Design a protein around this nucleic acid. Structure first.
Ligand SMILES: Nc1ncnc2c1ncn2[C@@H]1O[C@H](COP(=O)(O)OP(=O)(O)NP(=O)(O)O)[C@@H](O)[C@H]1O
Ligand SMILES: [Mn+2]
Ligand SMILES: [Zn+2]
Length: 346
RNA sequence: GUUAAGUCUGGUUUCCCUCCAGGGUAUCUAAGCUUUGAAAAAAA
């Protein structure tokens, strides 16, 4: 984490002017000792083994195949014993004097109430506070979150109005504006932080990461690819029927075989059809063109296996899911009829 | 023996409906529209 935050500092210093990175540099300079601690904690347990119970005098003994599972169960039991206590990473930080006095650095709205919470964690105090809107062009300069009129767009693109970021939230959003810094944390003590930040500080590879508005319009995109221009007459000059720029390539395999067909996929539909001003317009264009109106709904899909732990620990519960259970393995003889029926034929 | 004269009566009673069938079958809602547009983060 130290390496990656120092690399973020370096890269933000390099793009000191390229927008949203002046601010990343400014915050990494302001709150440095906060970011010294990683937003993720780890539990680490350790069981050992001796020559005893595995060797008799100089060769094996009986029950020697019975220690590896024994030690592994020791490890799993110590892990699940620890699991009884949950410590949040935010509890690592020394935020007492920062919040007891107004010595908390706040860019944007100086909070009237000492400090505000971040809208992305809800738990930590914010360091960057962008207004919702009253003018949205000088009110983000009169607050000093930006110094010039050119970085207004540069920041308003990455940090939305009304948003309040914590140090960690901003570090993440920065790593997201440029996802290749993680190579520092990825190559694993093989290069130097400076070598890699200098390797990727030359090339300008605009990585793209979809939003929820992107997904809620997939089949819209897919449609426009076929009905290319027969329904793009009012939208030719709205940069939605424009050209692919240089090399914008993404981890999203669907984005990488529909980007060049003629409809730029790097536009963000929250302004075009998922907007509230340009909405009555795009929908009115699509009525006379008889195409599907996008539905404002995606599907978050999560999958979890069943009983993987005791599967790796040898319990037959993932076989008899529901009938036998984890607790049934405190008196496993009691399910003799239903357990002996299984490994018998296994 | 003779004569002479006919007179009375001119439809009554009972039965006036009984029994079965008193609705059956089909259709029992259909197709649309299932929220939209303004307000998402405000001054002290
Ligand atoms: N022994 C292990 N080896 C590797 N990964 C593990 C091990 N134990 C747990 N994990 C992972 O750490 C997390 C443990 O959470 P969890 O997934 O709830 O445990 P579990 O063993 O899968 N029981 P389950 O609730 O059925 O999933 C998961 O992401 C697991 O993949
Ligand atoms: Mn699991
Ligand atoms: Zn935050």
């Amino acid at each position: 984490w130290r390496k990656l935050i120092e690399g973020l500092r370096c890269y933000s210093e390099r793009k000191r002017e390229d927008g949203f990175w002046n601010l990343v540099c400014r915050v990494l300079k302001l709150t440095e000792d906060l970011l010294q601690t990683t937003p993720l904690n780890i539990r680490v347990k350790q069981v050992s083994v001796t020559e005893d119970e595995i060797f008799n005098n100089n060769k094996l003994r009986s029950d020697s195949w019975k220690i590896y599972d024994n030690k592994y169960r020791q490890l799993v039991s110590e892990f699940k014993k620890s699991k009884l206590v949950k410590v949040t990473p935010e509890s690592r930080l020394k935020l007492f004097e920062l919040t007891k006095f107004d010595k908390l650095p706040q860019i944007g709205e100086k909070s009237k109430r000492g400090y505000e919470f971040c809208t992305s964690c809800g738990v930590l105090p914010a360091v960057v506070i962008m207004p919702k809107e009253d003018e949205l062009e000088k009110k983000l300069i009169d607050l000093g979150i930006a110094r010039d009129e050119k970085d207004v767009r540069s920041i308003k693109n990455m940090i939305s109005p009304g948003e309040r970021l914590c140090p960690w939230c901003l570090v993440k959003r920065a790593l997201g504006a440029e996802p290749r810094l993680m190579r520092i944390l990825l190559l694993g003590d093989l290069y130097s932080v400076e070598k890699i930040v200098n390797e990727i500080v030359s090339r300008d590879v605009k990585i793209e990461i979809p939003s929820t508005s992107d997904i809620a319009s997939i089949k819209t995109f897919e449609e426009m690819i076929e009905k290319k221009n027969e329904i793009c007459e009012d939208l030719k000059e709205e940069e939605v029927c424009e050209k692919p720029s240089e090399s914008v390539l993404s981890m999203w395999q669907w984005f990488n075989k529909n980007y060049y067909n003629g409809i730029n996929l790097t536009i963000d539909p929250e302004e075009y059809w998922f907007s509230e001003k340009r909405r009555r317009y795009y929908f009115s264009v699509f009525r006379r063109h008889r195409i599907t109106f996008p539905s404002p709904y995606y599907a978050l899909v999560r999958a979890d296996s069943d009983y993987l732990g005791d599967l790796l620990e040898g319990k037959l519960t993932p076989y008899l899911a529901g009938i036998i259970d984890s607790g049934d393995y405190a008196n496993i003889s009691e399910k003799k009829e239903e357990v002996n029926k299984l490994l018998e034929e296994y």
